[PDB]
Amino acid sequence: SMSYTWTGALITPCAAEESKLPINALSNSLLRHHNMVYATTSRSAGLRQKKVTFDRLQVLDDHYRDVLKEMKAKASTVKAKLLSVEEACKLTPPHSAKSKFGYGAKDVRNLSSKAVNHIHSVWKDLLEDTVTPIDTTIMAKNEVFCVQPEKGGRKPARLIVFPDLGVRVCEKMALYDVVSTLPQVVMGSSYGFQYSPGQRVEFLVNTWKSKKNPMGFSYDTRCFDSTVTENDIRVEESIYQCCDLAPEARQAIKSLTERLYIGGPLTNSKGQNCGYRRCRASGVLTTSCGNTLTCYLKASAACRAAKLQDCTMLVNGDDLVVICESAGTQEDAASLRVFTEAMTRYSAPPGDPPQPEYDLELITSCSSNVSVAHDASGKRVYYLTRDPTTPLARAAWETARHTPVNSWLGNIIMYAPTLWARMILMTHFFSILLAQEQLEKALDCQIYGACYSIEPLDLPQIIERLHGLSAFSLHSYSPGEINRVASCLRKLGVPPLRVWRHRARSVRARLLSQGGRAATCGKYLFNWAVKTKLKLTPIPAASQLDLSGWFVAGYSGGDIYH
Numbered sequence: 069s070m071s072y073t074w075t076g077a078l079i080t081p082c083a084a085e086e087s088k089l090p091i092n093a094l095s096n097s098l099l100r101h102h103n104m105v106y107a108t109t110s111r112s113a114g115l116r117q118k119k120v121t122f123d124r125l126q127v128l129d130d131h132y133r134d135v136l137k138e139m140k141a142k143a144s145t146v147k148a149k150l151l152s153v154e155e156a157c158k159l160t161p162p163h164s165a166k167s168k169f170g171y172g173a174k175d176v177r178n179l180s181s182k183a184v185n186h187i188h189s190v191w192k193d194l195l196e197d198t199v200t201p202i203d204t205t206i207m208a209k210n211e212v213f214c215v216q217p218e219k220g221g222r223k224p225a226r227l228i229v230f231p232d233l234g235v236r237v238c239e240k241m242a243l244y245d246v247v248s249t250l251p252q253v254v255m256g257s258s259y260g261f262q263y264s265p266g267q268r269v270e271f272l273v274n275t276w277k278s279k280k281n282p283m284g285f286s287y288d289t290r291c292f293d294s295t296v297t298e299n300d301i302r303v304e305e306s307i308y309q310c311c312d313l314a315p316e317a318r319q320a321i322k323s324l325t326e327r328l329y330i331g332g333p334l335t336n337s338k339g340q341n342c343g344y345r346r347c348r349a350s351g352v353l354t355t356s357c358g359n360t361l362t363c364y365l366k367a368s369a370a371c372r373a374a375k376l377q378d379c380t381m382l383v384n385g386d387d388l389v390v391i392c393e394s395a396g397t398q399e400d401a402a403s404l405r406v407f408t409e410a411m412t413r414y415s416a417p418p419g420d421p422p423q424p425e426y427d428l429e430l431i432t433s434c435s436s437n438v439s440v441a442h443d444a445s446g447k448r449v450y451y452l453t454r455d456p457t458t459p460l461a462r463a464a465w466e467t468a469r470h471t472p473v474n475s476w477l478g479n480i481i482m483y484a485p486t487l488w489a490r491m492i493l494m495t496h497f498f499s500i501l502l503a504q505e506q507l508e509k510a511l512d513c514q515i516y517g518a519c520y521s522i523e524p525l526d527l528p529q530i531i532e533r534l535h536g537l538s539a540f541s542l543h544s545y546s547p548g549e550i551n552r553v554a555s556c557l558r559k560l561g562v563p564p565l566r567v568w569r570h571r572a573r574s575v576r577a578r579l580l581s582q583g584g585r586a587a588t589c590g591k592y593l594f595n596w597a598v599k600t601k602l603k604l605t606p607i608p609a610a611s612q613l614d615l616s617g618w619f620v621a622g623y624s625g626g627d628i629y630h
């Protein structure tokens with residue numbers, strides 16, 4: 069069937085849309101080539117509509133069914149609980165889109181009677197009706213990128229499809245425990261969202277050296293959400309139903325699948341029918357889990373089809389990387405085409421065709437790659453990094469505009485050991501924070517699709533817990549990494565790293581002057597900026613701030629707050 073059917077009604081904005089980078093007094097200190105940074109808007113939605121719209125055909129063989137049977141066997145060991153309304157309400161972001169039915173997210177969060185009555189209303193309807201399609205809103209995302217003159221020009225807006233706030237609370241009640249716990253049980257070590265950045269690097273490195281002659285590839289599915297068929301969504305459901313569940317949860321999971329997950333009508337922000345979806349909704353609770361299960365299923369089956377030797381997979385939703393035994397370059401190339409042929413029969417064709425890699429550092433997955441530095445004692449250390457272009461374009465946007473999500477903060481957290489996050493991101497945003505005296509002000513950020521409120525003053529504690537103390541001491545980065553950073557800087561008109569070292573010594577001194585947690589920030593975050601360094605010991609406050617639920621599961625589009 070067609071992934072989408074369209075009426076012709078436009079996908080409409082909800083708020084003001086800016087496409088050119090906002091400029092203020094801080095902008096040039098970060099980035100000079102302003103016209104290279106852009107945000108996508110609804111203006112491009114029509115183009116995105118074109119590319120997400122195609123017919124899907126699926127051809128399912130014994131390999132597919134074999135792997136599914138294995139997955140279901142593991143699923144059957146999961147016992148999951150229903151969340152109460154109140155529990156579900158507390159998982160709602162303070163800034164989540166308001167209900168069409170006369171209440172918003174803050175009404176949900178403090179359990180207003182209007183919100184709770186309506187939520188109980190929605191739940192009862194799910195239990196009683198297993199057929200009526202549930203309405204969804206379709207919006208164009210506003211995301212920030214750098215122009216890619218060769219690779220394209222400007223990316224069209226991605227589309228987000230989501231049901232009403234009352235429905236989203238019900239999804240949590242039915243499925244939050246399932247989507248949090250089932251992926252690791254079914255996929256074990258291949259489930260990517262269980263890992264911190266450091267744990268992901270370790271899994272990648274251990275898997276690489278566990279092979280006699282390693283080969284690896286990332287597999288990029290063309291518009292993965294659009295490739296997800298009614299079959300795939302019913303198969304996901306059958307996996308969920310393997311769990312030990314309350315009878316009400318079984319019924320609700322069945323309604324939500326038939327009424328929402330499989331497809332339904334698409335409404336714009338003006339209330340017009342835009343058409344109909346028959347593929348994955350990007351803004352539902354099960355988006356991450358559904359995608360991960362489906363990607364893992366098709367790929368495991370495809371490896372058996374291509375006869376890949378000892379294939380290990382790492383799956384984060386639609387993001388897939390495979391490490392296996394090499395059969396030499398020409399055979400590996402042949403094997404990947406067969407893998408791709410099988411994935412294609414399964415309705416997951418490639419965007420850019422997969423290429424075999426024999427150097428772990430050249431494999432990019434979840435927009436990231438393994439690289440090497442040295443800790444204080446000269447020991448070689450693997451850590452996770454990425455091309456800094458997008459993070460830096462977004463930092464530029466966030467320099468002049470308060471955004472719902474502060475990408476810079478998430479990027480400091482996740483990419484703390486990197487050269488570019490330490491020298492540019494920490495330096496730039498701490499300087500801003502000092503000047504506004506907003507070190508103490510909690511900021512929203514996203515990690516694995518979930519929203520978190522975080523105080524920049526807790527960064528040292530958070531970084532130690534995720535990465536270790538070595539994150540504050542790394543040096544002697546690789547020539548490939550240094551080269552990529554310097555080149556990105558030249559491209560965007562970012563001051564050279566020598567300038568950042570200079571600003572950092574200033575930021576460091578100012579923080580240390582402040583005393584307290586601010587001083588701890590100066591000491592730990594910026595120890596790299598001094599010629600002779602303080603000895604970095606574990607900070608006492610690092611324990612009590614518990615990172616509960618940080619790397620359990622992914623929740624992209626799932627409207628989750630912690």
Ligand SMILES: CC(C)CCn1c(=O)c(C2=Nc3ccc(NS(C)(=O)=O)cc3S(=O)(=O)N2)c(O)c2cccn21
Nearest residue numbers: 265356359384385386387434478482515516517622624
């Ligand atoms: C160590 C890290 C894997 C490094 C990179 N990184 C991430 O991958 C993600 C991340 N991974 C994803 C991958 C694939 C999907 N696709 S889907 C829609 O669920 O099918 C979704 C996500 S996400 O929205 O859950 N966020 C981050 O939140 C983040 C923050 C800062 C770095 N990251």
